[PDB]
Amino acid sequence: MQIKTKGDLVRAALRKLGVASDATLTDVEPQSMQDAVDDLEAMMAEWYQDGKGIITGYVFSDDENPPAEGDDHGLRSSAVSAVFHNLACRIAPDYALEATAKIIATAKYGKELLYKQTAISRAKRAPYPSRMPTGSGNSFANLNEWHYFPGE
Amino acid sequence: ALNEGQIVTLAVDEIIETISAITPMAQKAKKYTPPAASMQRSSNTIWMPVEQE
Protein backbone atom coordinates (compact mmCIF):
# COMPACT_ATOMS: atom_id res chain seq x y z
CA MET A 1 0.00 0.00 0.00
CA GLN A 2 1.25 3.45 -0.98
CA ILE A 3 -0.61 5.13 1.91
CA LYS A 4 1.65 4.64 4.93
CA THR A 5 1.35 7.76 7.13
CA LYS A 6 -1.34 9.93 8.63
CA GLY A 7 -0.50 12.65 6.13
CA ASP A 8 -0.78 10.02 3.41
CA LEU A 9 -4.33 9.30 4.59
CA VAL A 10 -5.05 13.04 4.60
CA ARG A 11 -3.64 13.45 1.09
CA ALA A 12 -5.77 10.56 -0.12
CA ALA A 13 -8.82 12.21 1.44
CA LEU A 14 -8.09 15.56 -0.21
CA ARG A 15 -7.55 13.88 -3.59
CA LYS A 16 -10.80 11.96 -3.15
CA LEU A 17 -12.52 15.29 -2.49
CA GLY A 18 -10.78 16.78 -5.52
CA VAL A 19 -9.29 19.67 -3.54
CA ALA A 20 -5.58 18.89 -3.77
CA SER A 21 -3.62 16.15 -5.50
CA ASP A 22 -0.23 15.56 -7.08
CA ALA A 23 -1.51 16.88 -10.42
CA THR A 24 -3.18 20.09 -9.23
CA LEU A 25 -1.49 23.44 -9.80
CA THR A 26 -2.60 24.69 -6.36
CA ASP A 27 -2.09 22.96 -3.01
CA VAL A 28 -3.31 23.25 0.57
CA GLU A 29 -1.28 24.82 3.33
CA PRO A 30 0.72 22.75 5.83
CA GLN A 31 -1.36 24.27 8.63
CA SER A 32 -4.52 22.96 6.99
CA MET A 33 -2.79 19.60 6.62
CA GLN A 34 -2.02 19.54 10.35
CA ASP A 35 -5.62 20.49 11.08
CA ALA A 36 -6.80 17.58 8.93
CA VAL A 37 -4.46 15.27 10.83
CA ASP A 38 -6.00 16.52 14.07
CA ASP A 39 -9.42 15.70 12.61
CA LEU A 40 -8.20 12.21 11.68
CA GLU A 41 -6.87 11.63 15.19
CA ALA A 42 -10.15 12.81 16.73
CA MET A 43 -12.24 10.60 14.45
CA MET A 44 -10.14 7.49 15.09
CA ALA A 45 -10.14 8.18 18.84
CA GLU A 46 -13.92 8.53 18.83
CA TRP A 47 -14.18 5.24 16.91
CA TYR A 48 -11.78 3.40 19.24
CA GLN A 49 -13.67 4.27 22.43
CA ASP A 50 -10.72 3.39 24.68
CA GLY A 51 -10.90 -0.20 23.44
CA LYS A 52 -14.69 -0.66 23.47
CA GLY A 53 -15.30 0.54 19.92
CA ILE A 54 -13.90 -0.11 16.45
CA ILE A 55 -10.54 -1.86 16.76
CA THR A 56 -8.32 -1.06 13.79
CA GLY A 57 -4.66 -1.10 14.81
CA TYR A 58 -4.34 2.68 14.53
CA VAL A 59 -1.47 4.16 16.54
CA PHE A 60 -2.10 7.47 18.29
CA SER A 61 0.75 9.96 18.04
CA ASP A 62 2.57 11.35 21.07
CA ASP A 63 3.79 14.86 21.78
CA GLU A 64 7.38 13.72 22.37
CA ASN A 65 7.85 12.85 18.69
CA PRO A 66 6.74 16.20 17.32
CA PRO A 67 4.95 15.77 13.97
CA ALA A 68 1.88 13.53 14.08
CA GLU A 69 2.13 13.63 10.32
CA GLY A 70 5.00 11.37 9.35
CA ASP A 71 3.97 8.67 11.82
CA ASP A 72 2.87 5.34 10.40
CA HIS A 73 -0.83 4.87 11.06
CA GLY A 74 -0.40 1.14 11.63
CA LEU A 75 -3.70 0.10 10.07
CA ARG A 76 -3.91 -3.18 8.26
CA SER A 77 -4.04 -3.02 4.48
CA SER A 78 -7.84 -3.39 4.44
CA ALA A 79 -8.70 -0.44 6.70
CA VAL A 80 -7.04 2.32 4.66
CA SER A 81 -9.91 2.89 2.22
CA ALA A 82 -12.52 2.99 4.99
CA VAL A 83 -10.39 5.32 7.10
CA PHE A 84 -9.60 7.82 4.38
CA HIS A 85 -13.12 7.81 2.90
CA ASN A 86 -14.54 8.59 6.34
CA LEU A 87 -11.83 11.24 6.68
CA ALA A 88 -12.85 12.82 3.37
CA CYS A 89 -16.46 12.87 4.53
CA ARG A 90 -15.46 14.45 7.85
CA ILE A 91 -13.15 17.17 6.48
CA ALA A 92 -15.29 18.13 3.48
CA PRO A 93 -17.18 20.94 5.33
CA ASP A 94 -13.98 22.93 5.99
CA TYR A 95 -13.61 23.70 2.28
CA ALA A 96 -17.30 24.60 1.84
CA LEU A 97 -17.84 21.21 0.20
CA GLU A 98 -20.20 18.26 0.55
CA ALA A 99 -18.92 14.74 -0.04
CA THR A 100 -20.32 13.06 -3.12
CA ALA A 101 -22.77 10.19 -2.86
CA LYS A 102 -20.13 7.66 -3.88
CA ILE A 103 -17.78 8.86 -1.14
CA ILE A 104 -20.55 8.62 1.45
CA ALA A 105 -21.53 5.12 0.35
CA THR A 106 -17.92 3.93 0.38
CA ALA A 107 -17.52 5.42 3.86
CA LYS A 108 -20.54 3.49 5.15
CA TYR A 109 -19.38 0.25 3.51
CA GLY A 110 -15.85 0.66 4.80
CA LYS A 111 -16.89 1.33 8.38
CA GLU A 112 -19.19 -1.68 8.42
CA LEU A 113 -16.47 -3.90 6.93
CA LEU A 114 -14.06 -2.57 9.56
CA TYR A 115 -16.34 -3.61 12.39
CA LYS A 116 -17.47 -6.94 10.89
CA GLN A 117 -14.73 -9.13 12.38
CA THR A 118 -14.89 -7.46 15.79
CA ALA A 119 -18.65 -8.00 15.82
CA ILE A 120 -18.13 -11.67 14.98
CA SER A 121 -15.58 -11.91 17.79
CA ARG A 122 -17.86 -10.23 20.35
CA ALA A 123 -20.91 -12.34 19.43
CA LYS A 124 -20.24 -14.58 22.42
CA ARG A 125 -22.76 -16.64 24.38
CA ALA A 126 -22.91 -16.37 28.16
CA PRO A 127 -22.14 -19.38 30.38
CA TYR A 128 -24.92 -21.33 32.02
CA PRO A 129 -26.58 -19.79 35.09
CA SER A 130 -25.51 -20.76 38.58
CA ARG A 131 -28.94 -22.35 39.16
CA MET A 132 -28.84 -24.71 36.19
CA PRO A 133 -28.01 -28.36 36.94
CA THR A 134 -25.42 -30.12 34.82
CA GLY A 135 -27.71 -33.13 34.49
CA SER A 136 -26.77 -36.67 35.47
CA GLY A 137 -25.56 -37.66 32.03
CA ASN A 138 -22.40 -35.77 32.99
CA SER A 139 -21.14 -38.69 35.04
CA PHE A 140 -17.71 -37.20 35.74
CA ALA A 141 -19.09 -33.90 37.00
CA ASN A 142 -21.76 -35.57 39.11
CA LEU A 143 -19.22 -37.94 40.64
CA ASN A 144 -17.00 -34.95 41.43
CA GLU A 145 -20.08 -33.24 42.93
CA TRP A 146 -20.58 -30.68 40.15
CA HIS A 147 -24.34 -30.97 40.28
CA TYR A 148 -24.86 -27.34 39.26
CA PHE A 149 -23.07 -25.27 36.64
CA PRO A 150 -20.27 -22.96 37.85
CA GLY A 151 -21.59 -19.88 36.07
CA GLU A 152 -20.00 -16.43 36.27
CA ALA B 1 31.52 -92.22 21.65
CA LEU B 2 31.32 -89.82 18.69
CA ASN B 3 27.53 -89.75 18.89
CA GLU B 4 27.19 -87.03 16.27
CA GLY B 5 23.48 -86.46 16.68
CA GLN B 6 21.49 -83.26 16.27
CA ILE B 7 21.96 -80.34 18.64
CA VAL B 8 19.19 -78.22 20.17
CA THR B 9 19.00 -75.09 22.31
CA LEU B 10 16.77 -74.91 25.39
CA ALA B 11 15.58 -71.68 27.00
CA VAL B 12 13.63 -72.48 30.14
CA ASP B 13 10.82 -70.12 31.16
CA GLU B 14 11.58 -69.62 34.85
CA ILE B 15 12.73 -66.07 35.45
CA ILE B 16 15.72 -64.87 37.46
CA GLU B 17 14.28 -62.08 39.58
CA THR B 18 16.78 -59.24 39.92
CA ILE B 19 14.92 -56.06 40.96
CA SER B 20 13.11 -55.73 44.29
CA ALA B 21 12.54 -52.11 45.33
CA ILE B 22 10.42 -50.50 48.04
CA THR B 23 8.45 -47.25 47.93
CA PRO B 24 7.93 -46.07 51.52
CA MET B 25 7.31 -42.36 50.93
CA ALA B 26 4.54 -42.79 48.36
CA GLN B 27 2.69 -45.19 50.66
CA LYS B 28 2.65 -42.47 53.34
CA ALA B 29 1.89 -39.53 51.06
CA LYS B 30 -1.89 -39.41 51.04
CA LYS B 31 -3.82 -39.50 47.79
CA TYR B 32 -6.31 -36.92 46.55
CA THR B 33 -8.87 -36.83 43.74
CA PRO B 34 -9.59 -33.33 42.41
CA PRO B 35 -13.27 -32.32 42.08
CA ALA B 36 -13.04 -30.94 38.54
CA ALA B 37 -16.11 -30.63 36.33
CA SER B 38 -14.68 -31.07 32.83
CA MET B 39 -11.76 -33.32 31.90
CA GLN B 40 -9.25 -30.86 30.45
CA ARG B 41 -5.46 -30.96 30.29
CA SER B 42 -5.66 -27.19 30.85
CA SER B 43 -4.40 -25.73 34.13
CA ASN B 44 -5.82 -28.14 36.71
CA THR B 45 -5.48 -25.70 39.62
CA ILE B 46 -7.88 -26.82 42.35
CA TRP B 47 -8.06 -24.38 45.26
CA MET B 48 -8.63 -25.64 48.78
CA PRO B 49 -9.10 -23.64 51.98
CA VAL B 50 -6.65 -23.36 54.85
CA GLU B 51 -7.54 -23.74 58.51
CA GLN B 52 -8.72 -20.42 59.88
CA GLU B 53 -7.01 -18.30 62.51
Side-chain angles (χ1 to χ4, degrees), chain A residues 6-17:
Chain A
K6 311 191 194 316
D8 264 287
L9 290 170
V10 169
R11 274 181 281 271
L14 291 170
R15 176 195 81 233
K16 195 43 42 173
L17 286 174

Side-chain angles (χ1 to χ4, degrees), chain A residues 122-127:
Chain A
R122 304 201 221 241
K124 221 176 317 287
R125 227 194 213 294

Side-chain angles (χ1 to χ4, degrees), chain A residues 56-152:
Chain A
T56 38
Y58 194 77
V59 185
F60 296 87
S61 36
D62 44 354
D63 317 288
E64 177 252 308
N65 213 260
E69 160 55 335
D71 276 12
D72 321 62
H73 43 51
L75 306 157
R76 26 189 180 79
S77 211
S78 55
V80 181
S81 46
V83 157
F84 88 74
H85 274 103
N86 272 276
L87 190 49
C89 262
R90 276 245 187 155
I91 74 195
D94 304 30
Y95 311 87
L97 261 53
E98 170 72 52
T100 196
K102 180 61 195 203
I103 285 176
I104 304 175
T106 323
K108 293 151 56 48
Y109 176 63
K111 200 157 129 56
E112 211 214 23
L113 264 200
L114 259 183
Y115 193 68
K116 173 181 291 180
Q117 303 284 330
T118 313
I120 276 171
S121 187
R122 304 201 221 241
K124 221 176 317 287
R125 227 194 213 294
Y128 278 93
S130 211
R131 300 190 272 184
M132 172 79 187
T134 82
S136 52
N138 297 280
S139 41
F140 194 61
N142 288 43
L143 280 193
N144 286 287
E145 286 322 295
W146 269 107
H147 300 303
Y148 286 63
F149 273 103
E152 188 222 330

Side-chain angles (χ1 to χ4, degrees), chain A residues 2-68:
Chain A
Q2 295 290 296
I3 299 153
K4 306 191 244 234
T5 47
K6 311 191 194 316
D8 264 287
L9 290 170
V10 169
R11 274 181 281 271
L14 291 170
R15 176 195 81 233
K16 195 43 42 173
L17 286 174
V19 161
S21 171
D22 256 19
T24 64
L25 313 164
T26 89
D27 206 318
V28 313
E29 275 265 295
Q31 164 67 242
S32 284
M33 285 285 270
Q34 158 176 321
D35 271 19
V37 175
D38 282 344
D39 274 46
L40 165 69
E41 293 279 293
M43 151 180 127
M44 221 65 58
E46 147 168 303
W47 285 7
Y48 178 85
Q49 293 274 325
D50 300 2
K52 329 196 78 71
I54 305 192
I55 274 74
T56 38
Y58 194 77
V59 185
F60 296 87
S61 36
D62 44 354
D63 317 288
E64 177 252 308
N65 213 260

